[model samples]
Target: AVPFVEDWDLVQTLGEGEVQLAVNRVTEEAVAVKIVDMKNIKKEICINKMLNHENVVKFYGHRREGNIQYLFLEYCSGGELFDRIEPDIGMPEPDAQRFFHQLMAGVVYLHGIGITHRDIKPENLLLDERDNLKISDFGLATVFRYNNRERLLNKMCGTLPYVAPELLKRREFHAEPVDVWSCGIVLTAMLAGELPWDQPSDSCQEYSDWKEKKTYLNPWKKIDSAPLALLHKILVENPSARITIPDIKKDRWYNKPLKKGAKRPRVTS
Candidate 1:
C-alpha cells in the first residue's frame, strides 16, 4: 500500500493531460507529484521510467492510488512553456540556436543511450524556476535498438503533427531521425510563430507542399542565412538522410570558438 496523506494537496494541473499533485513532507521537502490518470496510461510510461538525462524530466517514483496512477516527478514551479502567452516567435537567431542547442543536447543524449522521444514538440518541454528546459510528458517515449540490422518498431504511434512520413506511411523507420524531423518543424515554428502545415482537414497536404517546396517563401530557406550550418542537416525530409547525434558532435558549430564581441544566445530566463 502507498503512504496515506491527510493532505494530498492539488497543485496546478500540468499540461497535456498531466496533473501536478503534491504532498508536503514533515522535513519540509516538497514532493511534487505527477498524478497521471490511469485511463491515460500507455506503454510510453514504461519508456519514460527507463530514460534519464539532466535536461529531461526526472521520475522519482510511481504508485497506483485507487484508480489513478501517480507518477512522482520533480517539482518545477517555473511553469509550462505553453503558459507563455504569445511567445516571441520571431526570437533572435542566436536565441533560437541556443535553445536548439540545449534541446539537441538533451535529445542527442537520449539517442546516444539508445532512446527515442517519439513525441518531441514545444508543449512537452517544461521550464524550471531557473528557466532551464526539462523535457516532460514522456507518454510517447520509446527506446529502440538496431537488432539484426533493423529497428524493431511495429506500432503505428506518435503525435500526428510531428509524426515522421515513414511511420505515417506504415514504413519501417529510425525513431531518432523522426524525432529530429519534428524538432526541425518546431525550430521553424519558433521562428515563424505559426504551424507551417496548418490544415483544416486531415488530408496532410502541407507535407506535400513542404516536400515540393511549393510554398512561395521557403521558411527553411531563411535557415540557410542563419549562422548555424547544422540547421539544414537536421531538417532533411528523408530519415536516412538526416543528421545523427554523432554527426552533430563532430560539427564545426558546436566546436568553433566564438568571435570577439559575438553575442551568444541566452537560455530562457
Candidate 2:
C-alpha cells in the first residue's frame, strides 16, 4: 500500500519536466507535484517550507519513495505565464501592470522575510484558479538575513536571459538586486512578448546595445516610455546602482489601480 497511491491520484504531467498534477482522493485538493530526484529535496525543504504569501505557491508537504521525490504544492489551474502572455506583442498595458504589481508584492514579501528567489522567470510564475500570480519553484531559493538565515553565493544558478549582468562577471553576488533585474526582464517580456536578448552578459549583442551603447533595442525599443524609464534603472549593469523595490512602489506606472473590468487579458496574435 503505497502512500502516494493511497492519498492522491497523479494526473497529467505539466510542460516543465518532472512536474505533475496530483489530486487528493478524499478532499479532492490538487497540487503541482514538483517531482525531482530523491537526492535533491534538501534545499527545497530548507527554503520552501516557511513561505506564506498570497502570490506564492503554497507547499502542503513533501513525499519521497524510490528514485523520485514529490513535493505537494498549490495547484495553479491557470498554468505558466507563457500560456497566457502573447509571444512578441506582450499583454495590454493594464494587464501587464497588474500582474507586475502582484509580482513585486510577492518579491517584497520574500525579501522582507530575508529570502531571495534567485530564479524568477515566466516559467516559475503560476496563476491560481483565480488567475492570481503565484510565484513558484524554490529549488534555487535561499535566505540572507537576520535570525535562522544568511546569501547576499552561487546565485549564478538562475534562469538565463533573466539573470543580472553581475552574475556572469563575478561568482558571488547579492540575490536581492539579482531578483530585481529578473523582474525587469519579466516586465519587458510582458511588454515586448520576447526577451531583450538570449543572455544578459558581455558576450551578447542585443544586451550590448543597451548594456554598453546606452541604446534601446528590440524588447527595450518596443516598450513605452513610462515603464521603459523604470526598466532602464532595473536592468542597469551596476548592481549597486540598480533601483530598489521600494522605489518601484512609488512609481506612477506601478501603483495604479486597474479599471473596473480589468481582468487577466488573453493572449493576442
Candidate 3:
C-alpha cells in the first residue's frame, strides 16, 4: 500500500521509475514524488541527506512500503539540460557559461561534503522554471570518508562520452578529478551540441586527432576567445593536469558576469 501523501497525482514514467506531480496540500506547492524499487540502490542513504543546495536536486524525504521506495523531490518543469540544448548548434555562449557556472558551484558543494557524483552529464542535469540548473541522479554517487589516505576510485561508471580517460583505462583514479573531467565534456557538449569525439582518450584516434589538429569540428571552430582557453585546460588528457573545480572558478571565462535575464534554449521532442 502507498503511504500518506495521497494528494500526489501520477504524472508519467521517468526512466526506470515514475514521477508524480504532487502537491503539499497544506502549502499548495507542487513537488515531485519518485517511486522506485529500493533494491536497486547500492550505497547507504547518508549521502543524499548531506546534499542540500539550490543547484542540486533537493531530496526532501523518503518513505517505504514493502519493496517499493518513494522519494519526495523538488519538481523542475524546465526539463533536463539535454532537453534544452539545440540539436545541431548547441547552447548559446552566455547560456552555456551560466549553466556551466551553476554546475561547477553544485559540484564544488558536493566535493566539499566528500561526495563524488560519479556521473555528470547533460541528461543528469535538470532545469527549473527559472532556467536554473540542478544536478540530479545519486545512484552512481560515491561518498568518501574525509580522512581516507588513498582517495582513488576503482569502479567503472558514467556515460561513455563524459567518462574520464582514466576510467576508460580501468585503473585506480581519484574521484574528485574524474568529476571535473566530466564537467569539461558537459561544457563542450553545451557549446558544441555534439561531442568533440565519439570517445575521449589518447588511445581514441579521433579524439587524439582532434587534440592534435584542433579541427573545425562543431564548436571548436566557434570557440575563439576565453571560452576556448578554458575548454582546452579542462579537456586535458592527463587527469592530474586537468583543471580542478577551484581553478575553474578562478578562470577568466568562468569569472565573467553572465548576461542578465539569460534563459536556457529549449529543444522540442
Candidate 4:
C-alpha cells in the first residue's frame, strides 16, 4: 500500500513500483518511499541490513504507519540510468566507463555478500545527485543464496534481455556467472546504445548470429578493442567458460583508473 502522509508530501509518482518522491515535512529532506506488502517483505530487511556501500542505495530505514508500510532511502535526483543512455548513440567512452566501474563495484560488493542481482539492467541502476550509479532492486531479480553461498537455489526468472543464455533452458545455473553475463549486456547497451536482441535464446536472431559468430551481423567492431576482448570472455555461452566477476575486475579495460571530478555527460537531450 502507498504510505499515507504524516510528515511526508508525495511530490509525485515516479515511473513505476509505487516509487513516489516524498519530502519529510520536518527536515524538508528528500526521500524515496517504496510501497510493499508486509507478508511480501517481512524478511526483506534481512537482505537490506547487509548492504553498506556507496554504489548501492542506502536503506535509510523503514516505516509502518497504520496500514501503510515503506522502505525509505537516499534520493536519486539523476533518475534511472536507462533514461540517460541515448539509443543507438550511447554515452561517450569515458561516461560509459565511469558508470560501468561504479556498477561493477556495486555488483562485486553484492556478490561478495552472496546477493545476486539477477537483472542488472540500467533501469534497476539509479544515479544519485552526483551521477554515482546506485544498484537497486527488482522484485523477481533477487536470489539471496547466502545460506550456502556457493550456489543459488532456483528454477529461473529474470528480465529476458539481460538474462544469461543458459537460464533460458529449464535449469539452475551458478549465480555469479549469470550476473556477469547481465553486466556484459548492460555494458553493451551502454556502449552500442542498443541491445543486440530481446533475449539470448536461439530464437533471437541477433543473439543466435552473435553466438554462432555469424558474419551477417552488425558486430561491435567499433567498440574499443580492449573492452571487446573482455566481452569475448564474459559473454560466453557456457557458464563455466564465462569469465568470473573477479577476473573481469582484473581485465585491462575494467582496470582503467578513473579520474575524479567535473560534470557528467548530459544524459538528456
TM-score of model 3 relative to the true fold?
0.88
- Candidate 4, residues 1-269, lDDT tens digits: the string is 33543578889787563778989776678988887654436445556767899998888788786577788877899999998889887777778888988988998898878787776899989999888999887344454565765755465766888889888874677788888899898888887788878888877778878877653345465577787778888889998899987788789988776555675677766
Q: How displaced is residue 108 in candidate 1, in Å?
A: 1.9
How many clashes show up per model?
A: 0, 1, 0, 0
Candidate 1, which segments miss by more than 4 Å at Cα? 1-8, 16-18, 21-28, 37-45, 83-88, 146-150, 199-206, 212-224, 227-229, 250-269
Score each candidate by Cα lDDT.
Answer: 0.63, 0.82, 0.80, 0.79
Give every collision pair in model 4: none
Stretches off by above 4 angstroms in model 3 are 1-6, 14-17, 25-27, 38-44, 148-150, 262-269
Q: Write the per-residue lDDT of candidate 2 for residues 162-183, one digit (tens) a residue.
A: 9888888887777788899999
**Which candidate gets the maximum lDDT versus the true structure?**
2
What tens digits encode model 1's per-residue C-alpha lDDT throughout 46-143?
Answer: 76667677788877777786878877787666765544424435455544555566778788877776777787877777767675677777666676
- State in Å the error of residue 83, model 4: 1.0
- Candidate 2 stretches with Cα past 4 Å from truth are 1-6, 37-39, 148-150, 212-216, 261-269
Cα displacement (angstroms), candidate 1, residue 126, comes to: 0.9
Report how far residue 67 has shifted in candidate 1, in Å.
2.8
